[PDB]
């Protein structure tokens, strides 16, 4: 047939027929899996082909395969659906011309540019699906370099940006761990591209930042100086380690310390609190457990301001005294006091509340710690700020009985990294200043009588609510404290006898 | 590597045979294809005498297969079936077997299309028998008024027994059934041996839907034989038999041993029936249930078993046999299940020996079958019978085989089940059925208190429910019987405590002195003139102090239930009964005037908007669409009771209004703006998108008075607008969407503007200099526009071509004054057309949406047409602006608009309509009555049944002269749809041959008018007479072919049910849009004005430019007719006509219009609040009043014509034609209002069909077509 | 004949 009436145009037929197509193509059963997945690879062949390039058919079967990877439930369409976006790159860069891949639909900048509409979006599956694409293509286009450059910065940006929209979507839907290993494999990538071609060149502008044309390398590391301390977990915490990947394979390849000290020297100490604290600078109702949205949000600000420069100051590039001193006026430690003082305390975002309380108690906790644990020390810009009796009470109160604070039983991940962070901060605070604050605190809940009251006439039995569970929750308490080392400061024996007396004690209440 | 399509066909033929020996469907296909190819074929050679023999053999293998087949395999009737429609020579199969075969397989779609096939190439009785028949057992009482008329030979009695069963009063049919069975004389001629039938089947169908069992089998036995008949073998003679009476002897007969008769007369036939082995294959795979219930009669559980599982096996193996858009037959099939499934739990549960010696397993199973029930409004009664009675016989039998208040626990889940099927019977309209089931339940509600009150408040519910149908001065007595017992003490511990049943008591109360007072009311003493113990019961002076106090007693039981329920949606009832009560106190007293109503009345203001407010608190849309009213209240009672509704306004969430913000923003600028400030400003930052058009155009003029309190009014305004806007994105936005309109466009809409103050005389001041800004600013000197906006490209060269006589017109034209020389103006205009250039052709013709090219954050499009009402709109979902594609293309007008396909965020595409030169205010009010329409619309239950909707685009005005319309996708024109179904020949022949109606009927106007051009029509009237014009119509229309639309439907269609359905919905459409269209009186309904959705084969209106009469009242040639109900349209109904589906269509919309003409006429009133462009708004509306409460629509025409064409050439011969004729139209033999709804459409459809109409209207209106 | 008689 000829190309006016006898070629009779199937565009309705593949509409249609292509969707069928992939879903049979991967469903359950071998032989029809066999029979499909080869068809709609040689379809995606011949339809990514000069003769059938920039025709109706490719853009359906294209459409075809997006709305695939963009989908509810049924998972093993998104993962092959990625392989055929795969492989449609494959052979639109293969079978066809170069000069002729420029205003065609099938054009690569053109699949991007849906790519990066789908990522940001407010649909939760979209979003996997551009996380997916990418992770399928990521192989392409950096075996043929000459578009790296172009959009490489443009999609890492955005990306991050969909990370940041993928925080507020779900518990871990799926999609962050695909956005991150999305950014994971851009990484590698940017990290051998312009080693020796770090050009500012009028490369594709991406969203978010400054209008310019010239954006070679330094704009995105001072776009992270700018805006990682956002209040999404994942994106800020991948936009510090971006930062700290990038700031060597720079010219000079100078270190993050004299980075960050030009930094402070050129535009001011304050820079690094506004942009470390965001809109968190600038709240009764908290003390109780509120619904509304805004108190996770400033929860969620606290937490991004407490862990931001907690990562600065855990690495050498600036110390706390700095950052902390008279220079700043920062609500940082006032925040804290504020959060400390009342966290002690429908129940359906009851817990959405507690859990998102309990997961900054421990971020202060790795914060003491890691104050503790630098050249730095002294105690005179933190003596009584946060480290003062409620934070000692907090400690004690998460050593034993955590579910007093909120922590619940059901987090398992959370309630057995909790000792370890307990042990760090009690075996931090041993060469502290302050020491006999912690042990007044301890001694007053766990010691030697509290020990054998708690030791009743009857431990075994049906009472297994409270000879079993505070006796448990102390037991845990005092490895602890041997953990740490401090089994002796808190719990002395006696002069008189060589052997300690509540170990004997002890010993013999399990023996009899 | 590629595609290996060199391949075999027995790689082809194989596997489709493989399938096809597998799937029943794919079989049915196949074989209907091969078939339809092979007789094909064989037309080529095998010559006409051995092809006539062909096809004669096959006629009679076809009528052997369906009149030898006993297991109606669905596939394999329908394959019979419609193989026989595609063939002509095959169409004449057997129309008694057909209608049995498609009606025992649930298969009536394709029965239908034969019949109708047949119908098609001595009236054929049988055949509409048959036809009716098959329409019936589906429903579609629509279909049946245009089958039964005395024109096919049928008599009067079969007519009026169906629109009797049209509604559910099934007795009234059965009535006239027998009646017309056992009429002798039939001094008519005699009724057909089909009819004879029909009439028996019918009656045999309403003792079904009735529940005397008693009836249903003498009916059915008596036919056979009589003196004690032999139903022992006569039924399996005369095959005849099998289909008519077996089911029905069958059914009524163990319908009637369930409840308790002794009769052993069945089981003797079924066993007999049994020893045969085609009887028994009959009797085992098409009942199966019978058999189960009838041998559990006889405590035989096993073949129980057997018989329950087998018919089980048979419900799936025929269910999945139905095709897949046969709908309707797969829920008929479906509502088997439950009544299968519980059978089985029954079996399941006596077998058992745990249960049935405890009592917990009884308990959870009464329990169960509590809150299991058929659907109410939905499952029909003869489901609801079989589930109700097959569970009383289990509880009867568990009952006696249990031996360890038992009794009283199940007679209460009895009666529990009872009172849930007259719930669903008098939902439903079965009315004599639910009278039956509260007598027999009358005896048992006594002896309980709660029993007792849920009792006589279903029966006086149920009363309230007939009331509606009667006239008057009965239904006074139905509602009159309620009271004598409604008043029961009841307080008894359980009105006292209970507050629900004491709502619903109060309720009712109110609403039987409702009725009683409305009554009275309508006829004002001819009731209560037949009152003899009833003067006593209405007194309880004579004329109107009576109606006074019930409607006293009426308010305030109904306050009493709403305080009562105010200590969900139990309370949004009554909000709304109060509102609507005394809001049509209100309205009544409104066409009156005096002092002590408006003391009586004064408490109803105040408490109807609170009540509604708290009622739009909850999510309420019954109410919302009420809104408008809340406004019209507060205009008429602004001295008192304004600020109530400001602290009720202040507390109702924010969305619940987007819908009726251009009635909000056209306030702000009148006194009692107030109580609306809240709201709008809420809405302008809370989502701030849905305001801003809106509030652009109205404070484009407010025009404030600044007398009393102007300055805080003016404050708010300019506070909002600051608010808005966001920076200059959307003004912007919208000044680039200006300049792309013609700008010849707007230099006419100056110079009508001008030549409209000083060319006609001179004595308007400031005007002039008021103007004197534009036309420099736009159309001007070409620096202005680029000192405002991005200078387009063409201005510079106005100018330069400009300069001549705009020297003149800027330098001494400023005080021409010469006031009687436009010559140069009009020539001036006629050269910018001369050099103009039109077209953009592409979107450099406006250099900001080319380069739109979102880079900042500078808030966002968001594409307009969005927050359409319901729900909270969820900004985030909205789709932005991305960009503009760059071609633009230009619809063919004299206004000129672009449709501009602008790119979304989301990488889509949507279409759309700029069009910079006209205020569409109008046809976004237009557009907002539809939504208000289809939201009424969709609260009758007649008209939610049939699902009929209006189908809206968005209409968002940016400003005065620049409006955007959305495009609805893959959407054509019905012009087109009529043209490119033609073939070449054809379409050539109606295009361009001076004998195709375009050019016969120009030719006919000159020869007998001797005009060539307009106003041939002014002298045409006076000229050719009623006769004349029919005759050229008729030879006329007798042109173009009759069936362009059923072939456009049968090439979209792909199967027979599916042209079924797409024929039906396009008729229901079209019909619905017909009468709204109507409602509010459109006019130039042209070939274009309508579009055909082609994925669903819906009808949509467009172009509501004439949106009130005005096709009429400001057109050179009038038109006199409603709408559109042409030739092709009726073409499509074939072979029935334009009295079936589509009158019951439009009888069914103007019922549930015309149940509150309050909305309507409430929704209108912005038309006077604020008047567009395009005295002239109360009397719309009152036009609009006027032919809503009944009214003769060629009264309503005349009114229009007379208005708008007095003093004409030819008036008084415009209000001749479209009165009538008197002897040929009905419209002229019938009052001039006070009219029926099915007169009004009698008469709405006669004015629109009308050949001295339609044969002398305006040409383009295509009204051959 | 195997009939498609093409090839793409
Ligand atoms: C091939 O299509 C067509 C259709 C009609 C015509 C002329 O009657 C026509 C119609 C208008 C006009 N007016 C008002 N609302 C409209 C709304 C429209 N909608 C909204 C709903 O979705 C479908 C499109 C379309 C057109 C509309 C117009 F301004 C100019 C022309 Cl010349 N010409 N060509």
Do not use: M, N, Q, R
């Given at each position: 047939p000829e190309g006016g009436q006898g070629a009779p145009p199937m565009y309705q037929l593949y509409k249609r027929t292509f969707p069928v197509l992939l879903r049979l193509a991967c469903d359950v059963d071998q032989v029809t899996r066999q029979l499909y997945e080869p068809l709609v690879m040689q379809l995606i062949h011949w339809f990514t082909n000069n003769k059938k390039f920039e025709s109706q058919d490719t853009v359906a079967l294209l459409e075809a395969i997006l709305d695939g990877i963009v989908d509810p439930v049924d998972s093993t369409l998104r993962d092959f659906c990625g392989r055929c976006i795969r492989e449609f790159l494959k052979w639109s860069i293969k079978q066809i011309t170069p000069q002729q891949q420029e205003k065609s639909p099938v054009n690569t900048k053109s699949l991007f540019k849906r790519l990066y509409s789908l990522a940001l979006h407010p649909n939760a599956f979209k979003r996997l699906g551009a996380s997916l694409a990418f992770n399928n293509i990521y192989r392409e286009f950096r075996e043929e370099e000459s578009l790296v450059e172009q959009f490489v910065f443009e999609a890492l940006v955005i990306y991050m940006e969909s990370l940041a929209l993928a925080?507020?979507?779900?518990?871990?839907?799926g999609t962050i761990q695909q956005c991150c290993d999305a950014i994971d494999h851009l990484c590698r990538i940017i990290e051998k591209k312009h080693v020796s071609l770090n050009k500012a060149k009028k490369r594709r502008l991406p969203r978010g930042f400054p209008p310019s044309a010239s954006l070679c390398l330094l704009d995105l590391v001072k776009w992270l100086l700018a805006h990682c301390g956002r209040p999404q977990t994942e994106c800020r915490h991948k936009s510090i380690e971006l930062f700290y990947k990038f700031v060597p394979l720079l010219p000079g390849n100078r270190s993050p310390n004299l980075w960050l000290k030009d930094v402070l020297k050129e535009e001011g100490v304050s820079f690094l609190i506004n942009t470390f604290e965001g809109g968190g600078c600038?709240?009764?109702?908290?003390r109780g457990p509120f619904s509304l949205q805004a108190t996770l949000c400033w929860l969620d600000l606290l937490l991004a301001a407490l862990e931001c420069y907690n990562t600065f100051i855990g690495e050498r590039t600036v110390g706390a005294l700095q950052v902390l001193g008279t220079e700043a006026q920062s609500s940082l430690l006032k925040a804290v006091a504020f959060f400390l003082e009342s966290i002690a305390m429908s129940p359906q975002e009851g817990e959405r509340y507690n859990y998102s309380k309990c997961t900054v108690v421990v971020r202060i906790m790795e914060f003491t710690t890691t104050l503790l644990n630098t050249s730095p020390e002294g105690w005179k810009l933190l003596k009584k700020d946060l480290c003062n009796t409620h934070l000692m009470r907090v400690l004690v109160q998460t050593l034993c009985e955590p579910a007093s604070i909120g922590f619940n039983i059901g987090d398992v991940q959370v309630m057995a990294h909790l000792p370890d962070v307990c042990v760090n901060l009690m075996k931090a605070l041993k060469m502290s200043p302050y020491k006999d604050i912690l042990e007044t605190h301890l001694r007053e809940k766990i010691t030697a009588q509290s020990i054998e009251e708690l030791c009743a006439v009857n431990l075994y039995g049906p009472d297994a609510q409270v000879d079993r569970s505070r006796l448990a929750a102390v037991v845990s308490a005092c490895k602890q404290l041997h953990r740490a080392g401090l089994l002796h400061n808190i719990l002395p024996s006696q002069s008189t006898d060589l052997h300690h007396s509540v170990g004997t004690e002890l010993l013999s209440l399990v023996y009899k | 590597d590629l595609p290996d399509i060199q391949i075999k066909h027995s790689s082809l033929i194989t596997p489709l045979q493989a399938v096809a020996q597998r799937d029943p469907i794919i079989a049915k296909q196949l074989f209907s294809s091969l078939f339809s190819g092979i007789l094909k074929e064989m037309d080529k050679f095998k010559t006409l005498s051995e092809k006539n023999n062909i096809t004669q053999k096959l006629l009679q293998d076809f009528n052997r297969f369906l009149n030898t087949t006993f297991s109606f395999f669905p596939p394999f009737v329908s394959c019979i079936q419609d193989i026989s429609c595609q063939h002509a020579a095959l169409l004449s199969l057997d129309p008694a077997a057909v209608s049995a075969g498609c009606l025992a397989s649930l298969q009536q779609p394709v029965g239908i299309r034969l019949l109708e096939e047949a119908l098609l190439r001595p009236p054929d009785v049988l055949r509409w028998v048959e036809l009716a028949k098959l329409y019936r057992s589906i429903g579609e009482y629509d279909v049946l008024r245009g089958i039964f008329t005395s024109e096919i030979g049928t008599k009067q009695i079969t007519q009026s027994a169906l629109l009797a069963e049209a509604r559910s009063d099934y007795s009234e049919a059965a009535k006239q059934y027998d009646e017309a069975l056992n009429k002798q004389d039939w001094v008519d001629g005699e009724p057909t041996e089909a009819e004879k039938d029909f009439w028996e089947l019918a009656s045999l169908d309403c003792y079904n839907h009735l529940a005397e069992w008693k009836s249903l089998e003498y009916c059915s036995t008596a036919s056979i034989d009589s003196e004690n008949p032999p139903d022992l073998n006569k039924i399996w003679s005369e095959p005849f038999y099998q289909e008519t009476y077996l089911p029905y002897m069958i059914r009524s007969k163990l319908k009637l041993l369930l409840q308790g008769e002794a009769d052993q007369s069945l089981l003797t036939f079924i066993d007999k029936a049994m020893h045969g082995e085609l009887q028994k294959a009959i009797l085992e795979l098409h009942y199966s249930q019978e058999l189960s219930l009838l041998y559990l009669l006889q405590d035989d559980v096993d073949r129980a078993k057997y018989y329950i599982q087998n018919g089980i096996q048979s419900f799936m193996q025929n269910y999945s046999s139905?095709?897949?858009?046969?709908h309707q037959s797969r829920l008929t099939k479906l509502q088997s299940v439950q009544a299968l499934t519980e059978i089985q739990e029954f079996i399941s549960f006596i077998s058992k020996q745990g249960n049935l010696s405890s009592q917990v397993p009884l308990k959870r199973l009464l329990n169960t079958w509590t809150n299991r029930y058929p659907d109410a409004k939905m499952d029909p009664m003869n489901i609801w019978d079989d589930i109700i009675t097959n569970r009383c016989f289990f509880l009867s039998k568990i009952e006696e085989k249990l031996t360890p208040d038992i009794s009283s626990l199940i007679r209460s889940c009895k009666f529990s089940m009872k009172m849930k099927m007259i719930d669903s019977a008098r939902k439903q309209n079965n009315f004599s059925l639910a009278m039956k089931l509260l007598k027999e339940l009358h005896?048992?509600?006594?002896?309980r208190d709660d029993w007792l009150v849920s009792w006589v408040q279903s029966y006086c519910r149920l009363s309230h429910c007939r009331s509606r149908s009667q006239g008057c001065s009965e239904q006074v007595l139905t509602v009159l019987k309620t009271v004598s017992l409604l008043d029961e003490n009841n307080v008894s511990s359980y009105l006292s405590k209970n507050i629900l049943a004491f709502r619903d008591q109060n309720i009712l109360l109110g609403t039987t002195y409702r009725i009683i007072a409305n009554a009275l009311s309508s006829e004002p003493a001819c009731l209560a003139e037949i009152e003899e113990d009833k003067a006593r019961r209405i007194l309880e002076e004579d004329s109107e102090k009576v109606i006074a106090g019930l409607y006293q007693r009426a308010f305030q039981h109904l306050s009493e239930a709403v305080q009562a329920a105010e200590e969900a949606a139990g309370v949004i009832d009554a909000y709304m009964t109060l509102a609507d009560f005394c809001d049509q106190q209100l309205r009544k007293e409104e066409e009156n005037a005096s002092v002590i109503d408006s003391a009586e009345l004064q408490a109803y203001p105040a408490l109807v908007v609170e009540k509604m407010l708290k009622a739009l608190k909850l999510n309420s849309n019954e109410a919302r669409l009420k809104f408008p009213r809340l406004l019209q209240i507060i205009e008429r009672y602004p001295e008192e009771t304004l600020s109530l509704m400001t602290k009720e306004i202040s507390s109702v969430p924010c969305w619940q209004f987007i819908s009726w913000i251009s009635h909000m923003v056209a306030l702000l600028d009148k006194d009692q703006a107030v109580a609306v400030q809240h709201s709008v400003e809420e809405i302008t930052d809370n989502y701030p998108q849905a305001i801003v058009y809106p509030f652009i155009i109205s404070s484009e003029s407010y025009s404030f008075k600044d007398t009393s309190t102007g300055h805080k009014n003016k404050e708010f305004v300019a506070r909002i607008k600051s608010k808005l806007d966001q920076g200059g994105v959307i003004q912007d936005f919208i000044n680039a969407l200006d300049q792309l309109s013609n700008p010849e466009l707007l230099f006419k809409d100056w110079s009508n503007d001008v030549r409209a103050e000083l060319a006609k005389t001179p004595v308007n001041k400031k005007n002039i200099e008021k103007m004197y800004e534009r036309m420099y600013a736009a159309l001007g000197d070409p620096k202005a526009p680029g000192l405002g906006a991005f200078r387009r490209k063409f201005i510079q060269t106005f100018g330069k071509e400009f300069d001549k006589h705009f020297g003149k017109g800027g330098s001494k034209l400023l005080r021409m004054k010469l006031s009687d020389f436009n010559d140069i103006t009009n020539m001036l205009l006629l050269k910018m057309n001369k050099d103009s250039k039109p077209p953009g052709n592409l979107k450099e013709c406006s250099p900001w949406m080319s380069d739109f090219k979102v880079e900042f954050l500078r808030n966002e499009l968001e594409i307009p047409g969005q927050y359409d009402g319901r729900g909270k709109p969820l900004p985030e979902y909205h789709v932005r602006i991305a960009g503009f594609d760059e071609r633009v293309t230009v619809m063919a007008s004299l206004r000129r608009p672009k449709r501009i396909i602008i790119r979304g965020h989301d990488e889509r595409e949507h279409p759309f309509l700029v069009k910079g030169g006209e205020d569409l205010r109008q046809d976004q009010r237009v557009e907002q009555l539809f939504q208000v329409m289809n939201g009424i619309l969709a609260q009758d239950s007649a008209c939610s049944q049939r699902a009929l909707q209006l189908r809206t685009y968005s209409v968002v005005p940016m400003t005065s002269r620049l409006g955007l319309i959305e495009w609805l996708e893959n959407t054509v024109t019905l012009k087109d749809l009529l043209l490119n179904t033609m073939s070449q020949e054809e379409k050539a022949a109606y295009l361009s041959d001076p004998r195709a109606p375009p050019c016969e009927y120009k030719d006919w106007l000159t020869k007998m008018?001797?005009?060539?051009?307009?106003g041939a029509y002014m002298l045409m009237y006076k000229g050719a007479n009623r006769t004349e014009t029919v005759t050229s119509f008729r030879k006329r229309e007798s042109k173009v072919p009759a069936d362009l639309l059923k072939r456009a439907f049968v090439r979209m269609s792909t199967s027979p049910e599916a042209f079924l359905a797409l024929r039906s919905h396009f008729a229901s459409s079209h019909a619905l849009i017909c009468i709204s269209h109507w409602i509010l009186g459109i006019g130039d309904r042209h070939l274009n004005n309508f579009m055909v959705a082609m994925e669903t084969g819906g009808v949509i209106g467009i172009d509501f430019g004439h949106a009130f009469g005005s096709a009429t009242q400001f057109l050179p040639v009038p038109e006199l007719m409603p709408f559109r109900l042409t030739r092709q349209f009726i073409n499509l109904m074939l072979p029935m006509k334009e009295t079936g589906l589509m009158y019951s269509i439009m009888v069914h919309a103007l019922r549930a219009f015309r149940s509150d003409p309050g909305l309507l006429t409430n929704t209108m009133d912005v038309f006077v609040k604020e008047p567009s462009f395009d005295w002239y708004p109360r009397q719309k509306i009152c036009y609009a009043k006027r032919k809503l409460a009944g009214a003769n629509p060629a009264v309503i025409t005349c009114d229009e014509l007379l208005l708008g064409h007095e003093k004409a050439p030819a008036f008084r011969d415009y209000v001749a034609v479209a009165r009538g004729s008197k002897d040929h139209n009905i419209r002229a033999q019938e009052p001039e209002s006070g009219l029926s709804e099915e007169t009004q459409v009698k008469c709405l459809m006669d004015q629109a069909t009308d050949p001295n109409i339609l044969g002398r209207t305006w040409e383009g209106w295509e009204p051959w077509m | 004949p195997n009939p498609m008689f093409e090839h793409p």
């Open positions: 925080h507020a979507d779900e518990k871990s839907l600038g709240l009764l109702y908290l | 139905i095709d897949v858009l046969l005896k048992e509600s006594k002896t008018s001797g005009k060539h051009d307009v | -």
